[PDB]
Amino acid sequence: YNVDENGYYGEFGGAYIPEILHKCVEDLQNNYLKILESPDFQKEYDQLLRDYVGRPSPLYLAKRLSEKYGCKIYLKREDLNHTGAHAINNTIGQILLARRMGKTRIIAETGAGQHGVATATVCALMNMECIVYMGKTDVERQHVNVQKMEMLGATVVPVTSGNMTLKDATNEAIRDWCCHPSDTYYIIGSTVGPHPYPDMVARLQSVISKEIKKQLQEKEGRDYPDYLIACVGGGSNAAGTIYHYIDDERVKIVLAEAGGKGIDSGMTAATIHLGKMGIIHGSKTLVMQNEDGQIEEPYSISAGLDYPGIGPMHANLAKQKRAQVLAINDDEALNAAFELTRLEGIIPALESAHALAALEKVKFKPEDVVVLTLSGRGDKDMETYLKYKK
Amino acid sequence: YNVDENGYYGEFGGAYIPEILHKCVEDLQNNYLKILESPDFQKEYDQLLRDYVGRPSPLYLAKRLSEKYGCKIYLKREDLNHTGAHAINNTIGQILLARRMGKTRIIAETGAGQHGVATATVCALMNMECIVYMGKTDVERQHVNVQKMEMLGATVVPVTSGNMTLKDATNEAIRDWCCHPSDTYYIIGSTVGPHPYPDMVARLQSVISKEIKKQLQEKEGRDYPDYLIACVGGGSNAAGTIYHYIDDERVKIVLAEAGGKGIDSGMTAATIHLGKMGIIHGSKTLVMQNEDGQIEEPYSISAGLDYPGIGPMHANLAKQKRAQVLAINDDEALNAAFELTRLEGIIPALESAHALAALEKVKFKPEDVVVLTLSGRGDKDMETYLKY
Ligand SMILES: Cc1ncc(COP(=O)(O)O)c(/C=N/[C@H](Cc2c[nH]c3ccccc23)C(=O)O)c1O
Ligand SMILES: Cc1ncc(COP(=O)(O)O)c(/C=N/[C@H](Cc2c[nH]c3ccccc23)C(=O)O)c1O
């Protein structure tokens, strides 16, 4: 269920792009693995993960949370990463690749602002020009992260097309990318876009499941859990979380996508529940489509889940029934965020709370071992959490 | 240079309290150490540091900083800890102690909001009632921490005494403690207050120096740096950073206190520079005083450094010349924060930025190995940073 030699996961994936990018995408294909696997990349990569990011991220037995659901739940604490989310695993990896390929101008899209902060973070470290596209809606709702990016010296470009969300910021980044093939590297923020971006970002996040294996070995005497649970906007934290377990049928995979106001409300981002075959941002995958077959304007309270497409990996997983996918609504997420706060003293990202909310919908046995990926911390969503509390 | 059996660092320290606290403190002294050393404690303590907090925190070689000062500078990244600061090392320890003393009501003071969030955090975790006193000036300067405390289920009590800063929040907590002796445990937020709070908190923070010795051994082939650099409000992140180095004369210690608008200006927190022998919150230490002998109202841009006292360990250390203490002014701290942000992609707390600014004030040789403790991340100070 991992990628094939042509960029495909079953029938989903590939690279579907105008000729203007054919050259630089082709360079990226058939160099990215050479670079990822070189001893130089892997040393500097691993050194920055350890000293800069603070990997490995803990695997934490959440005791009161385990008592509520009548089983053993561990949280993979990506929320403790430098910059507060899993995104930084990806930006560190991609910036090292970008430099190996001689690129000098860095762009990215962001919804939650975690990928934007993680991109401005590594660009300041490296002293490289940073431009971050962000939907206007998102710059309002995730303003703490816009501030961080501006202090880090990045240029934040509000995007005013569509409903001004991730798909739109991505559209703008892609337009930027098209005008600047020579000098610009595009740090895509999820397991989305043209091959090799899905597999690349999956590889860079795989460190998550590499650690889980070792940490479960220490704690449980076996290297596999009964369940992996992760939210999914485009697929990147889930991918990392499942990479080294993707084919291992002892491990059940539960993914939580954003149901918004409910999958039938006309306001949602439940791509698996609602999507049809399309091309989105250079990938042939499942995507929400409106009544004239346009890519649909999605909704979610969560900026990082609010994307109408899904990575081709998860399109495939879902289609094959290797992974079960749940639509989780705004309210369910909000309540699960308040849940982890009072139970474990951890304020989660609204994104990650979609994953937490899924614990209500699964029939656990007492001997079950669950690993849920806490993809980030909720500092960004405090205004929203406190509004909800009133 | 470490505490003696009486709770003194040379002439500083002790417990100078009203008689109403004599017994809680007595109970606290001469159980604290037995609990800290107990296996049950050390096992639960160590498991939460590793799994909940994310220790060991990395020791990060900051190449661009190092270039700019012409030496090797490592940042001890307490900013990466659960809650974003060193305080969680303290609150984890104290809450466990509190539960083993059979206490059920937890109170605390906070200025920067970090110690307040760390307290609210561990009280949420443990299913316990949590009250945090915070100065009114501070509830506004550091409002992102107030929001976190609220959602964690803690009662944030604004204090409007004095100039509504740490000292006043601290007076209010102590008054709560007196008034509720049987049932309440008081999680003090720095190496301050009556014995054994200063030593206890130093010990909980000592985890920092413990990691630095092993991490320097792996990175440099020796267990000790030429310089340790840390900011001090009351002195806990500092104490932690130096605890296992405190008698090692090969290691230079540089402590950065808050100069505010400047030491000779009216408006400062430069206790080592300005303070006089006195008593604050039950500790005999150096403290700022007016011409009367009243406790002088301090000022600093940084809430967590804005304290007219200092821990007894550092009064002793400064007095005996074991530690060099620099007063860093507001603007110096702000520029150093922006410097780290730009050079290493790390936004420090304004507090920790006082330590960063001290890098300007020391002449380093190229063979120097510096460890500076990055006590916190600066999400709380983003409004201040962009005003500037
Ligand atoms: C804390 C946190 N958890 C989970 C997610 C969900 O993303 P995933 O499915 O890739 O694991 C995000 C998204 N972060 C965004 C999301 C994002 C960037 N580019 C995208 C392309 C498609 C879908 C989502 C995105 C950001 O900070 O920007 C996040 O910040
Ligand atoms: C990130 C950060 N770095 C440094 C400091 C300085 O404190 P230290 O000298 O103890 O290492 C603080 C203070 N945080 C406060 C400070 C505080 C609480 N109670 C105190 C009593 C005396 C002096 C300072 C304090 C908080 O969040 O509340 C801090 O939050």
Side-chain angles (χ1 to χ4, degrees), chain B residues 85-86 109-116 166 170 189-192 231-238 304-305 307 349 351-352 375-376 380:
Chain B
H86 65 285
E109 84 298 346
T110 195
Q114 292 291 326
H115 180 75
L166 256 168
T170 309
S190 195
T191 48
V192 295
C231 68
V232 291
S236 64
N237 93 83
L305 299 195
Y307 185 76
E351 290 73 25
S352 318
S375 56
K380 43 166 204 67

Side-chain angles (χ1 to χ4, degrees), chain B residues 256-276:
Chain B
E257 68 185 0
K261 299 290 176 205
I263 57 171
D264 299 322
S265 99
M267 300 162 74
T268 308
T271 302
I272 297 294
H273 273 83
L274 289 190
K276 272 170 274 279

